């Protein structure tokens, strides 16, 4: 189908933004140990919101790209509107680049005045730092986009894959609406903040990721659509049965009742299961491939996504999800460790996985690229992925020492925040080194095209 | 074991836990007046929340252990900087003197905040320190 071509601008832009994300990561990582680096021009918080918003935005672009590509094929017809897909692309790209520039070009409080935050105050919450007009512009893009892809499903064949993807996509946009709700009571603000972050990343985004995985396995493996889609329903069932009460693992210390200590701990303890099932899923249906596939990189991307999502979300998630432990590790370099591995292993990797399947047959080159291009992609895969495990090991060691020095001893014996950070210095230099190897990976990956 | 079976486990699981979740959030939301001491949630604390947001303190600091990990936990800072009595007065100095300019050290910005703004900040943080947080953090260092 020809309207599958509108996915290309989405995947390209996403990869450009991904580069920006890594550079601002590297700036912050240096700021950790040379604390006045780039100060006062780009204070760490400005660098941080660039890093974290570039991550959310580029992943969103990959998702829309992924939907624009596979929805036509599933639905067995042309996309409701290519000209819509392109108008939305430039609106979203300009709105993204605009809000990022606001962050860098005006002190935050000035950007707040300037965008009239005081009428509808939604700014200065983590991951949600974009002006209210930027948020509004994202909702409008998401409505367009959902109509575009949702109409295509309507007049076309329904499949479980495409309907789980749409459910996830709709859920994402809906939950995003809670970013407009900024209570005056701090505990209430935190309580609802997690309906965005947690119900995205351990709920609705898992429908998106799983749908993308299932499609790639349908196309790569020649295994029956019926069995693939069964396991897809099992996986997302386990996602939401663990995940919804699971939100509670963020409700231990924000000021809500202590029953959340139990509820949060017990259901979160089970949230690894879907990522475990996604590894049994990808490995088994690639093992059972009725046919070989010219692009052997995608198969690697799909196996690796599921192992990394499982290591990052499942294993690191679990290591700190029990309240008696989280009590000590809350808000610590351990959190940063888990968060890096989980966002990379689940979400960055699934976007690169669908790029690996779709890029050749979108630039009209074929199923796969020449064999030089394919060895690079794999190098960029191992370099990024291995670097990230090291990023997470070095931060995990930092987090363990932080907990020991700062969190465990009593008053008088416990080391101050600032002093314990000097003690962590080596681990932060080493992470910054790993961060360099990762960029070299992203560049190597990018030189595959 | 069929597809249809799996899809209904998904359907029933999600509705039931969605409804369990909403019911818990109804309950939880009833307890918040006492837990957070909303009685004390003054116009001053609510204005402080706005200055906390407008200057993105959370982009460098944690509050109740959430936010960024560059700078210290501010949920309980009030207890490390002369308590109830003298904390407001500390904070005024603290905001004026930034950046400290110590070579190689993590640096905090100068926000050119008015005295009312900083006082509202101090109330917000004081009040935040008193939320019943199930005894978090472990000690006075946050």
């Amino acid at each position: 189908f020809a309207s599958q071509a509108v996915a290309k601008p989405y995947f390209v832009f996403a990869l450009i933004l991904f580069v920006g994300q890594i550079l601002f990561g590297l700036i912050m990582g240096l700021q950790y140990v040379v604390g006045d680096f780039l100060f006062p021009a780009i204070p760490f918080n400005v660098a941080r919101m660039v890093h974290t918003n570039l991550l959310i935005v580029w992943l969103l672009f990959g998702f829309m790209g992924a939907a624009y590509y596979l929805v036509p094929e599933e639905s067995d017809c042309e996309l409701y509107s290519p000209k819509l897909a392109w108008i939305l692309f430039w609106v979203f790209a300009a709105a993204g680049v605009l809000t990022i520039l606001g962050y860098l070009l005006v002190p935050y409080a000035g950007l707040a005045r300037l965008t009239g935050n005081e009428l509808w105050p939604t700014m200065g919450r983590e991951f949600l730092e974009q002006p209210t007009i930027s948020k509004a512009g994202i909702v409008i893009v998401a409505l367009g986009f959902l109509f575009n892809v949702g109409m295509t499903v309507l007049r076309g064949r329904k499949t479980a894959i495409s309907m789980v993807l749409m459910t996830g996509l709709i859920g994402l946009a809906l939950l995003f609406l809670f970013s407009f709700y900024n209570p005056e009571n701090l505990t209430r603000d935190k309580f609802y903040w997690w309906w965005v972050v947690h119900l995205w990343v351990e709920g609705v985004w898992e429908l998106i990721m799983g749908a993308i995985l299932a499609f790639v396995l349908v196309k790569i493996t020649g295994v029956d659509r019926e069995v693939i889609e069964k396991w897809l329903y099992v996986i997302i069932a386990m996602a939401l049965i663990s995940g919804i009460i699971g939100t509670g693992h963020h409700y231990f210390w924000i000021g809500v009742p202590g029953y959340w200590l139990w509820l949060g701990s017990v259901f979160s303890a089970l949230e690894p299961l879907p990522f475990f099932a996604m590894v049994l899923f990808a490995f088994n249906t690639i093992n059972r491939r009725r046919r070989d596939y010219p692009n052997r990189a995608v198969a690697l991307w799909a196996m690796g996504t599921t192992v990394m999502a499982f290591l990052g979300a499942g294993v690191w998630g679990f290591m700190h999800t029990l309240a008696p432990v989280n009590y000590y590790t809350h808000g610590t370099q351990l959190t940063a460790a888990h968060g890096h591995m989980a966002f990379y292993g689940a979400y960055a990797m699934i976007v690169m996985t669908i790029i690996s399947y779709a890029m050749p047959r979108l630039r009209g080159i074929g199923e796969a690229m020449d064999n030089r291009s394919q060895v690079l992609e794999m190098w960029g895969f191992w370099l990024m992925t291995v670097a990230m495990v090291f990023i997470t090991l070095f931060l995990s060691a930092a987090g363990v020492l932080q907990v020991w020095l700062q969190r465990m001893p009593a008053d008088g014996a416990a080391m101050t925040f600032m002093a314990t950070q000097d003690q962590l210095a080596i681990f932060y230099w080493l992470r910054e080194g790993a961060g360099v190897v990762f960029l070299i990976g992203l560049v190597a990956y990018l030189l595959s095209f | 074991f069929t597809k249809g079976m799996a899809r209904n486990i998904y359907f029933g699981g999600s509705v039931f836990f969605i409804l369990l979740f909403l019911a818990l959030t109804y309950h939880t939301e009833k307890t918040l007046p006492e837990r957070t001491n909303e009685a004390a949630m003054s116009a001053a604390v609510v204005r402080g929340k706005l200055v906390w947001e407008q200057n993105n303190c959370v982009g460098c600091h944690t509050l109740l252990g959430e936010g960024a990990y560059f700078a210290p936990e501010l949920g309980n800072v009030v207890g490390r900087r002369g308590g109830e009595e003298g904390f407001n007065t500390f904070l005024q100095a603290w905001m004026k003197i930034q950046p400290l300019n110590v070579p190689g050290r993590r640096a905090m910005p100068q926000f050119h905040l008015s005295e009312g703004q900083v006082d509202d900040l101090a109330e917000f943080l004081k009040w935040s320190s008193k939320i019943d947080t199930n005894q978090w953090p472990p000690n006075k260092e946050g």
């Epitope: 008088g412 014996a413 416990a414 080391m415 600032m418 002093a419 314990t420 | 400290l100 110590v102 190689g104």
Partner: antibody
């Protein structure tokens, strides 16, 4: 309240040694450099050195490398200074004091609290 | 080592008046000069650091200025308790060094 309590007057003979203490309270002892400062009568303050109790590292003015040895015992929050091969010139008041800032890399800063001083009198 | 010379060594003045005292470094210490007040029966008290930053709790009648090599301390309207010994200390480099003091005395 941050406080530093220093030990009492010590008398010693020339060529002997003396060891004094500084008991810290009201803060994280392991998180701040403890400095030691000499004052002889109408003679101007002199920085002897400092110890970082968080990792036991020390730093000495070259003029006191021979003379002074600095230690800390963290269970007790007390820092110690031992002065050896005493001479009339070591007769003075000796102060400990706390870096006003926390952490290892702020070795050269100012001090926000001082001890009341320990007198060392060297005589035959 | 950077050497510090304070002047004048003695200054007489009266309650309600303003004085300013000097501190000179033998080489540049950028902006890193602190000041301490010394009084009998009391531990030394940090007044100012980094040239002009007032230490927490210190009244605004104290102020300081300078960079590189030349620094001052001013008290705006002397109070009875301000008559005391004043020392400066450089905090730009190892080894830390101090000036020998200006003694501010009560005129009668």
């Amino acid at each position: 309240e941050v406080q530093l309590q220093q030990s009492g007057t010590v008398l010693a003979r020339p060529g002997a040694s003396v060891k004094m203490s500084c008991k810290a309270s009201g803060y994280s002892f392991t998180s701040y450099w403890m400095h030691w400062v000499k004052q002889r009568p109408g003679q101007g303050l002199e920085w002897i050195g400092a110890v970082y109790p968080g990792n036991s590292d020390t730093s000495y003015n070259q003029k006191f490398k021979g003379k002074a040895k600095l230690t800390a015992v963290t269970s007790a929050s007390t820092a110690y200074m031992e002065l050896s091969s005493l001479t009339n010139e070591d007769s003075a008041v000796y102060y400990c004091s706390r870096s006003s800032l926390d952490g290892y890399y702020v070795k050269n800063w100012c001090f926000d609290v001082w001890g009341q001083g320990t007198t060392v009198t060297v005589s035959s | 080592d950077i050497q510090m010379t304070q002047s004048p060594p003695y200054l007489a003045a009266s309650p309600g008046e303003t004085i300013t005292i000097n501190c000179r470094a033998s080489k540049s210490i950028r902006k890193y000069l602190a000041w301490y007040q010394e009084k009998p029966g009391k531990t030394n008290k940090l007044l100012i650091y980094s040239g002009s930053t007032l230490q927490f709790g210190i009244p605004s009648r104290f102020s300081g200025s300078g960079s590189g090599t030349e620094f001052t301390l001013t008290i705006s309207s002397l109070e009875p308790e301000d008559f005391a010994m004043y020392y400066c200390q450089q905090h730009n480099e190892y080894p830390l060094t101090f000036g020998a003091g200006t003694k501010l005395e009560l005129k009668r």
